[PDB]
Amino acid sequence: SCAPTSLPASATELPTTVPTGTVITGDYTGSYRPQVHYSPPKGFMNAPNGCHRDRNGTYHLYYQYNPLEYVAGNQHWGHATSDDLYHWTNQPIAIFPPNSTSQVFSGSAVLDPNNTSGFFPNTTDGVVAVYTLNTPTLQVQEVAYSTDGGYNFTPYENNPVLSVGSNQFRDPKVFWYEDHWVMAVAAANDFTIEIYTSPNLTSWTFASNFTHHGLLGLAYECPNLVQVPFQDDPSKSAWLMYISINPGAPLGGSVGQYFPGDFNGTHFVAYDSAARIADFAKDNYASQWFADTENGESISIAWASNWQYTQQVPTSAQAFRSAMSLPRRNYLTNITRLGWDLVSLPYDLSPVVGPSLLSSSEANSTADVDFTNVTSNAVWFSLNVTLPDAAIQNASLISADASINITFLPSTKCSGSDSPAATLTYFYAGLTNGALALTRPAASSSWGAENPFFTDKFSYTLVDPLTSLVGVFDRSMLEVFVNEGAHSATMLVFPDSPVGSMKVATGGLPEGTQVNLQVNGLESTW
Amino acid sequence: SCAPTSLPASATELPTTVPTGTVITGDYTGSYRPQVHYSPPKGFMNAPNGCHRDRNGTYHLYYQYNPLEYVAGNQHWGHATSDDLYHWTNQPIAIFPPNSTSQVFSGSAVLDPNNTSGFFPNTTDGVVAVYTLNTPTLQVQEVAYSTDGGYNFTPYENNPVLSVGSNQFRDPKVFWYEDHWVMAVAAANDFTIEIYTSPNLTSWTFASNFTHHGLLGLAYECPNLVQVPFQDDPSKSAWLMYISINPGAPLGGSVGQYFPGDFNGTHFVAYDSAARIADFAKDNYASQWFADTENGESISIAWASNWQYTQQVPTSAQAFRSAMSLPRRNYLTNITRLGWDLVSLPYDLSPVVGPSLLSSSEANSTADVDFTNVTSNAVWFSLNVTLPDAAIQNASLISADASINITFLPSTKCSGSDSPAATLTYFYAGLTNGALALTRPAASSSWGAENPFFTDKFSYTLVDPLTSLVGVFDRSMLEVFVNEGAHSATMLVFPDSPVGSMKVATGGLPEGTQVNLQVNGLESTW
Ligand SMILES: *[C@@H]1O[C@H](CO)[C@@H](O[C@@H]2O[C@H](CO)[C@@H](O[C@@H]3O[C@H](CO)[C@@H](O)[C@H](O[C@H]4O[C@H](CO)[C@@H](O)[C@H](O)[C@@H]4O)[C@@H]3O)[C@H](O)[C@H]2NC(C)=O)[C@H](O)[C@H]1NC(C)=O
Ligand SMILES: *[C@@H]1O[C@H](CO)[C@@H](O[C@@H]2O[C@H](CO)[C@@H](O[C@@H]3O[C@H](CO)[C@@H](O)[C@H](O)[C@@H]3O)[C@H](O)[C@H]2NC(C)=O)[C@H](O)[C@H]1NC(C)=O
Ligand SMILES: *[C@@H]1O[C@H](CO)[C@@H](O[C@@H]2O[C@H](CO)[C@@H](O)[C@H](O)[C@H]2NC(C)=O)[C@H](O)[C@H]1NC(C)=O
Ligand SMILES: *[C@@H]1O[C@H](CO)[C@@H](O)[C@H](O)[C@H]1NC(C)=O
Ligand SMILES: *[C@@H]1O[C@H](CO)[C@@H](O)[C@H](O)[C@H]1NC(C)=O
Ligand SMILES: *[C@@H]1O[C@H](CO)[C@@H](O)[C@H](O)[C@H]1NC(C)=O
Ligand SMILES: *[C@@H]1O[C@H](CO)[C@@H](O)[C@H](O)[C@H]1NC(C)=O
Ligand SMILES: *[C@@H]1O[C@H](CO)[C@@H](O)[C@H](O)[C@H]1NC(C)=O
Ligand SMILES: *[C@@H]1O[C@H](CO)[C@@H](O)[C@H](O)[C@H]1NC(C)=O
Ligand SMILES: *[C@@H]1O[C@H](CO)[C@@H](O)[C@H](O)[C@H]1NC(C)=O
Ligand SMILES: *[C@@H]1O[C@H](CO)[C@@H](O)[C@H](O)[C@H]1NC(C)=O
Ligand SMILES: *[C@@H]1O[C@H](CO)[C@@H](O)[C@H](O)[C@H]1NC(C)=O
Ligand SMILES: *[C@@H]1O[C@H](CO)[C@@H](O)[C@H](O)[C@H]1NC(C)=O
Ligand SMILES: *[C@@H]1O[C@H](CO)[C@@H](O)[C@H](O)[C@H]1NC(C)=O
Ligand SMILES: *[C@@H]1O[C@H](CO)[C@@H](O)[C@H](O)[C@H]1NC(C)=O
Ligand SMILES: *[C@@H]1O[C@H](CO)[C@@H](O)[C@H](O)[C@H]1NC(C)=O
Ligand SMILES: *[C@@H]1O[C@H](CO)[C@@H](O)[C@H](O)[C@H]1NC(C)=O
Ligand SMILES: *[C@@H]1O[C@H](CO)[C@@H](O)[C@H](O)[C@H]1NC(C)=O
Ligand SMILES: OC[C@H]1O[C@](O)(CO)[C@@H](O)[C@@H]1O
Ligand SMILES: OC[C@H]1O[C@](O)(CO)[C@@H](O)[C@@H]1O
Ligand SMILES: *[C@H]1O[C@H](CO)[C@@H](O)[C@H](O)[C@@H]1O
Ligand SMILES: *[C@H]1O[C@H](CO)[C@@H](O)[C@H](O)[C@@H]1O
Ligand SMILES: *[C@H]1O[C@H](CO)[C@@H](O)[C@H](O)[C@@H]1O
Ligand SMILES: *[C@H]1O[C@H](CO)[C@@H](O)[C@H](O)[C@@H]1O
Ligand SMILES: *[C@H]1O[C@H](CO)[C@@H](O)[C@H](O)[C@@H]1O
């Protein structure tokens, strides 16, 4: 059986009224439907919201959700739960607008076990959502509380809790700092993150502004102010302001950027005036960090799309638009020359890793790996390359031809051009030394070639040699992680024919180079 | 009849020894050879150097030049002169390395009419070049002087004039401030522009550092610190620090960025912590400003290429690699919401503008313009759109379909895919409101499709409606300028078949919208 390219009418037909108190049933069998990423059972999804872990260890993912269309609008908070951030259970819609002319825009959630809010006289498991209500004339911050573990929310009786009389004032991210609540919120079209403080989540006082930092684009969105541990030393950490911008990103549309710095409970001060882009492709946006994580883990998830084409991608015939990124483990590190770097790695994938397709220690060879018998149409790969120390001390010893080439090739079973669906090319030396290209050839996709914003080629240039590469392919998405997650990219692909194999080639590698390649099929979560 | 795709052996064969005191003869007839842009007669060119206007109105363009190969190396300063920045005369090589193991890297030139240097006891027309000398172990700043108008240079007897014992210290840009010389120079791998002062161009004193601003990439290069007049008010100006970075640009490889701010003769202070990219495509790098211009004119030129593919472009069979951008008139303006903006417009094109190919006032139409009779294979176009007052006040009145689509189509006489060589698509509203796409379809170019770094699609998103668009096509290059040069892009194209025509379509425009389209052929300067 080939995965279907179109579904039954009952799978794709959207209701004319929003379902309340019942799970929306999903057909997750589409040829483009990711099997280890979250996507909504039906309809259009964007930013992750309300991300938190409850005391029982359940991760709550909420999401911007149009239950009525395959385009942006009518925003509700959708809800899915998981104990491992891969095996998702769909839940009833969590937050509804008060009427048909208002929308529940992005926001965050916190546990209030000490009842600072006063909402929780008889429970230590209270959840508070802080979110933007979009009116035709205003964006205001509102509060809603849950006594049932974050499934049903009661709006605060004296909403809204915060307004500045603006229709560009959104995406509150709330967290506890020592003795008070902090809110980071975007004065979106003023390129300002405003910081407010509160003892009880309902009374907010202005603290400070963070304005005109890094790339402006056309708006600041979905600010996250978080403490991120050092990759090489868990006992150390720094504060990080993460800001999403859209439109006006360098590659077009939407992108995330970050600022390492100091936070003292009222003011964030960046360590320098540099701009730093989080992902070197164009399908990673609106990253939100999970509240109430265990063991000083920095855990985030993003929307794996771009505002320039998210409402036009050819998945609506498969009963959805938009998926989340892999869930991410985050660290800070210093990389050679550039210094500060936001590290992103896939959150523990062990619960979805299936049997080995290939284990190889062959250097200067091509490994040809078929996965047509992997029903998920999803694979994980790991490539380690360890140069001899002679080639580290003297890079002039490396051949101009020393390179890595990865290609994802169309299925022989589920066919059509022979073009790869996705390529990665890296050079150790030569005229483009350290250059890594990630491509989705226009030739592989009639839709992609025609969409004016669907960029074919992305690149990042290393200073250090490439020593590790991890990747996940999941039907219509490729994520890559270079040098223990120092550099990462999230890339959508919509090939005319589904991918059925991958080739991993190394060439021109120095004598004594160690190569280790591992490829595993992934098990579907649905 | 058709422009040659391959030239005689004598046209492309490079000498084995560098010619001294003689002009290198060029064949400028190649199907990819620009006819209104500067490119070297033979060999490989990169960054513009020594840019200045002499007292008699001759513009001097020097350039990084490998006379021996079609790749980077063996750097000399090549030299060309013009009175209008379009009609270039090739000159003998201006600056030579002192031996076979050193290279003349980038730098600047200034007039020294008051003989501050002591080089010019008997002339007020003295020119001083300040440039990086590259050795395998060091980058140092050197001085050479010319008494003959900048054709022949004598090295300063006590070179070098500035060393810090670094191998990453280059691209000095020198200018007069009130009572002293200022040098902006890149501590390239430290992401620092160092400012030095001198009474006499030979003795340099450290003044200040400008460090870790905007995008770092992998290196700061070719800093320019210049006073740029306001577009709306010639009597006002602000200081601007322009920095080129490579590699590590968001689109891959090389890009220019800028910082508006204050300069007081010793210290540059940016007005804010924002990063601002100069050009929204990937083929505009190492912009240098002309010294000693007239009438408060800010004039610059850039290298129209990208380091990721400049040494691989398919023009070596046509006796060259690399062209300059159009010469640019620069201003600063405030654009809606985003604020500070570097304006770039083509410098007075009137000396190359040939007869009209089309004048049209038709809205909601497709104009087909054939230019197979324009021997230059170069055209200028101008498109104005004036929306009615009603739609300027209420944009909700604009149709989702309101759009402008320009395509450059392959010649049928000199061919074959029917793919456009280049496209521009802009939307007034709909789901991607204000989004402008500039594309070079992979389908149009076998070389382009295969090159892993030759990105197919670029975009910029407007806030204001598009009201003006100017463009120049020149055989293998397209430059576009949006809303009186508020936004600009430089894009190389290497189509399999030469461009023979363009289509300009408007559609879905509000009742009462005024459209004016002008297209002119350009006259070859060679
Ligand atoms: C913390 O930051 C917030 C967000 O930036 C800030 O609130 C804002 O203040 C600015 C003023 O600095 C407001 O901007 C103005 O809004 C009015 C109404 O639309 C405009 O008429 C003003 O126009 C003039 O000034 C502009 C900027 O120089 C010019 O471009 C223009 O031509 C006019 O001369 C101006 O745009 C803005 O509306 C608010 N935004 C919000 C969301 O409140 C707040 O003041 C900061 N607080 C502290 C303590 O610093
Ligand atoms: C102005 O900026 C320049 C350039 O950044 C400063 O010089 C530089 O100083 C740094 C130290 O901050 C040097 O880094 C160092 O590298 C050497 C060798 O790798 C190492 O031994 C040192 O311990 C240090 O890590 C850098 O090399 C150097 N660069 C250059 C081009 O000289 C300068 O100090 C600044 N001046 C002021 C007043 O701030
Ligand atoms: C762009 O707008 C800014 C902010 O309005 C201008 O900067 C100021 O200009 C006024 C004079 O009109 C000065 O008094 C202020 O001190 C300036 N700075 C600030 C932060 O307000 C700037 O001049 C404008 N630039 C252009 C090119 O128009
Ligand atoms: C809909 O709800 C919004 C937000 O509470 C409010 O501003 C608006 O007046 C409501 N309209 C109606 C008629 O219910
Ligand atoms: C929250 O605290 C503020 C003081 O910051 C107080 O004015 C307000 O009454 C409190 N609200 C509730 C509902 O307890
Ligand atoms: C935090 O730092 C700022 C200066 O950046 C200072 O003004 C403020 O008072 C500090 N707040 C606390 C709680 O110390
Ligand atoms: C990066 O280096 C800087 C300068 O030494 C240091 O202050 C910072 O703690 C380092 N960060 C990490 C993550 O190692
Ligand atoms: C499935 O495919 C893999 C990779 O080609 C192969 O190693 C494995 O033996 C196959 N298994 C079956 C049961 O076909
Ligand atoms: C690398 O080897 C070359 C000779 O092959 C030598 O000239 C050079 O100095 C060496 N470089 C280093 C970093 O040791
Ligand atoms: C590859 O190197 C990584 C470091 O990024 C390490 O965690 C992993 O165990 C190695 N994989 C193997 C041995 O193939
Ligand atoms: C990888 O592909 C590139 C194409 O740019 C090629 O130049 C390089 O030699 C190849 N390396 C391999 C097959 O390992
Ligand atoms: C890989 O090829 C390079 C360059 O030809 C060579 O020096 C090296 O010994 C080769 N290694 C293997 C494992 O064949
Ligand atoms: C070559 O010339 C440069 C610049 O004058 C000088 O620094 C270098 O030492 C010279 N090398 C030799 C081998 O003559
Ligand atoms: C340049 O000026 C410095 C400082 O006054 C002085 O030491 C030096 O002799 C001058 N050099 C020349 C060649 O005039
Ligand atoms: C220039 O400005 C800096 C502050 O940015 C100051 O330290 C210096 O004294 C000023 N120099 C002059 C010549 O005024
Ligand atoms: C467009 O408008 C400008 C306004 O200055 C005018 O100079 C120019 O002639 C017009 N260009 C076209 C499209 O005719
Ligand atoms: C331009 O192209 C877009 C699709 O990219 C299309 O929707 C629009 O209707 C076209 N408009 C014109 C003016 O041809
Ligand atoms: C353009 O076409 C639209 C849709 O048919 C129409 O409403 C509008 O009046 C037309 N405008 C002009 C300027 O012809
Ligand atoms: O994509 C992020 C942006 O879109 C929204 O989520 C609305 O669905 C906003 O709250 C946010 O600024
Ligand atoms: O392209 C810019 C860079 O390349 C050089 O011009 C050398 O040819 C350097 O001077 C500069 O940093
Ligand atoms: C969906 O699309 C595939 C090919 O893309 C067809 O094979 C299938 O029948 C359906 O139309
Ligand atoms: C659900 O959506 C699909 C794709 O548009 C339709 O083909 C189907 O009939 C139903 O409307
Ligand atoms: C369940 O109730 C909610 C209340 O907001 C409605 O929006 C929904 O349509 C359904 O009736
Ligand atoms: C330019 O091309 C000619 C052939 O036309 C060669 O002979 C020459 O060496 C250079 O490559
Ligand atoms: C003319 O002289 C220069 C040195 O000034 C040489 O490099 C060139 O080859 C020719 O002899």
Numbering used by the authors:
A (entry chain A), B (entry chain B): 142 to 556, 562 to 672
The authors write:
Rhodotorula dairenensis β-fructofuranosidase is a highly glycosylated enzyme with broad substrate specificity that catalyzes the synthesis of 6-kestose and a mixture of the three series of fructooligosaccharides (FOS), fructosylating a variety of carbohydrates and other molecules as alditols. RdINV subunit is composed of two domains, similar to the rest of the reported fungal β-fructofuranosidases within GH32. The β-propeller catalytic domain contains residues 185 to 487 and is constituted by five blades (I-V), each involving four antiparallel β-strands (ABCD) with a “W” topology. The β-sandwich domain, extending from residue 495 to 673, is composed of twelve β-sheets ordered in two six-stranded clusters of antiparallel β-strands.
However, only complexes of this truncated variant with fructose, sucrose or raffinose were obtained, the crystals belonging to the P21 space group with two complete dimers within the asymmetric unit that are essentially similar. Diffraction data of D188A-RdINVΔ21–139 in complex with fructose, sucrose and raffinose were collected at the ALBA synchrotron station (Barcelona, Spain), being indexed in the P21 space group with four molecules in the asymmetric unit, at 1.86 Å, 2.38 Å and 2.27 Å, respectively. The crystal complexes show clear electron density at the active site that allows unambiguous ligand modeling.
